[PDB]
Ligand binder design. Structure first.
Ligand SMILES: Cc1cc2nc3c(=O)[nH]c(=O)nc-3n(C[C@H](O)[C@H](O)[C@H](O)COP(=O)(O)OP(=O)(O)OC[C@H]3O[C@@H](n4cnc5c(N)ncnc54)[C@H](O)[C@@H]3O)c2cc1C
Length: 486
């Protein structure tokens, strides 16, 4: 096959020897039977977007992109049954006329339902669990046992394991999700100091349906975004200083005119995100320069306070348009009833570590919250139904297609992430997002990662027993899965 599959950020790519794209469940069953019989690789792939290339296998991959129909809406239960190849956007568009939406959304909507659930993807909202916990039922095509129906009523132990199964336990053909009524949100964006955030944090998380913090390294600016249901006819309030787009961008444009080349015709057409990339591109690993870029960004956010009203699917998405390295961890932050400071303590220690080690850390460091999941492979697995997890995402941008700048940033990010891993993750019980975890080549570092996984997931041995039972010739797993779970 001549199909090349590249991830979002162009950090991983694969050209599979065999690429299957069945149009029917019947065709997929035949593919899985035949691959099992011959011991041929068929790793499942959705949109192929994962930052770590989790789906990729040079031997063989199977895509259900052509199996993308909404099969049934249950009005009374507010549930949707969809083929696993549908993109989130496609399900959202199909649910609009039914007055339904998904209980939550990440920053993008071009993921397939299969790829979304299999990694335990999440949005924000301390009372709202990750998407795997929103799965009511599913159908799973397995090498060793054929097609199996799973739910709380049908083999709940395997259901909970396979709905967040990393593509290793079977090919998911159909998913039933728990929806909520279609609704408008009021989004409030405001800037705070570390000290102001600490004062109001406990209440803010419990009194706002959605909260996200955007921490700006080397500044005392935190951008707070809250979203709440908008009563029937309420209008967006208006902030008393009104800044034009040009006034918001002024600090970034002024800074860019002070680099080795306030606006030209070429600088003028740059969005905020394009301007941030143009600034970092000057000297992306020079910490003194990144301090100045981050301070100019804080000034942009200070000029961007205000309110927006929109349908939840429009409002909860946000811009990750630029290629980047990301790492995100989930760690426990008590419960709705028993608050914990760990979420803010983590961020204080991270900011201190960045400053001490001289990390050229750009903005933002994204902080979200979810409820716990009952899926044993969820990074937010908890037996507590009112558990709260904090999710912290660090980033470095790849502002150009220049191969040598990209390598240097790649190495810089490996070191930034390793410092968080060695200094913070064990202390806070932090677990890496499955779509962002990288396999170290250093077999020492690999064994330390395997030990962290066994500590974070007491479910690991049961996952590997299900892999042996359902996929004994290992046709669904790639080198990454084999490296993480030997
Ligand atoms: C710009 C960007 C923003 C993002 N924002 C967020 C965010 O806000 N929140 C968040 O939690 N994540 C986020 N992610 C991560 C994203 O949700 C995951 O990478 C997700 O898995 C992507 O879906 P996909 O369809 O591309 O899956 P792929 O990357 O193709 O596959 C992911 C996994 O699903 C498995 N798989 C796919 N289809 C099937 C199937 N039918 N049956 C069985 N296994 C299957 C694959 O084997 C693999 O293990 C973001 C990613 C990007 C690139």
């Amino acid at each position: 096959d001549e199909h090349t599959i590249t991830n979002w950020s162009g950090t991983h790519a694969v050209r599979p020897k065999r690429f299957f794209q069945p149009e029917s469940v019947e065709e997929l069953e035949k593919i899985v039977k035949e691959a099992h019989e011959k011991g041929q690789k068929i790793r499942p792939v959705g949109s192929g977007l994962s930052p770590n290339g989790l789906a990729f296998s040079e031997d063989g991959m199977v895509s259900l992109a052509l199996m993308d129909k909404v099969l049934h809406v249950d009005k009374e239960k507010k549930q949707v049954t969809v083929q696993a190849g549908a993109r989130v956007q496609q399900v959202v568009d199909a649910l609009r006329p039914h007055g339904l939406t998904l209980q939550n959304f990440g920053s993008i909507s071009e993921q397939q339902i299969g790829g979304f659930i299999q990694v335990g993807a999440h949005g924000t909202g301390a009372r709202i669990p990750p998407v795997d916990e929103q799965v009511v039922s599913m159908k799973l095509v397995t090498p060793a046992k054929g097609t199996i129906e799973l739910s709380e009523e049908k083999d709940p132990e395997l259901f909970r394991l396979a709905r967040c199964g990393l593509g290793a336990l079977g090919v998911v053909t159909e998913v039933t999700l728990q929806c909520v009524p279609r609704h408008k949100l009021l989004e409030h964006t405001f800037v705070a100091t570390m000290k102001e955030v600490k004062k109001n944090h406990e209440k803010l998380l419990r009194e706002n349906k959605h909260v996200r913090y955007m921490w700006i390294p080397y500044t005392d600016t935190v951008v707070v975004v809250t979203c709440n249901p908008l009563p029937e006819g309420k209008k967006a309030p208006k902030v008393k200083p009104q800044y034009s787009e040009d006034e918001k961008l002024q600090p970034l444009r002024n800074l860019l005119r002070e680099a080795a080349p306030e606006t030209s015709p070429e600088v003028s057409g740059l969005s905020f995100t394009e301007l941030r990339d143009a600034l970092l591109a000057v000297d992306p690993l020079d910490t003194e320069w990144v301090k100045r870029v981050n301070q100019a960004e804080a000034e942009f956010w200070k000029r961007s306070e205000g309110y927006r009203v929109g349908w939840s699917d429009e409002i909860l998405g946000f811009d990750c348009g630029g290629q980047q390295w990301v790492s995100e961890v989930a760690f426990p932050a008590g419960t709705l009833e028993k608050p914990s400071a760990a979420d803010l303590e983590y961020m204080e220690e991270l900011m201190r570590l960045i400053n001490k080690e001289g990390i050229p850390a750009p903005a933002p460091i994204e902080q979200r919250w979810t409820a716990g999941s009952s899926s044993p492979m969820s990074p937010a697995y908890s037996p507590s139904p009112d558990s709260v997890f904090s999710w912290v995402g660090i980033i470095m941008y790849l502002p150009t297609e220049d191969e040598e700048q990209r390598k240097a940033i790649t190495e810089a990010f490996r070191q930034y992430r390793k410092l968080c891993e060695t200094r913070l993750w064990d202390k806070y019980g932090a677990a890496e997002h499955w779509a962002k975890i990288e396999v170290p080549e250093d077999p020492e570092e690999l064994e330390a990662l395997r030990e962290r996984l066994r500590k974070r997931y007491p479910g690991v041995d049961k996952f590997n027993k299900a892999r042996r039972e359902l996929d004994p010739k290992n046709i669904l797993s790639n080198d990454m899965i084999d490296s993480l779970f030997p």
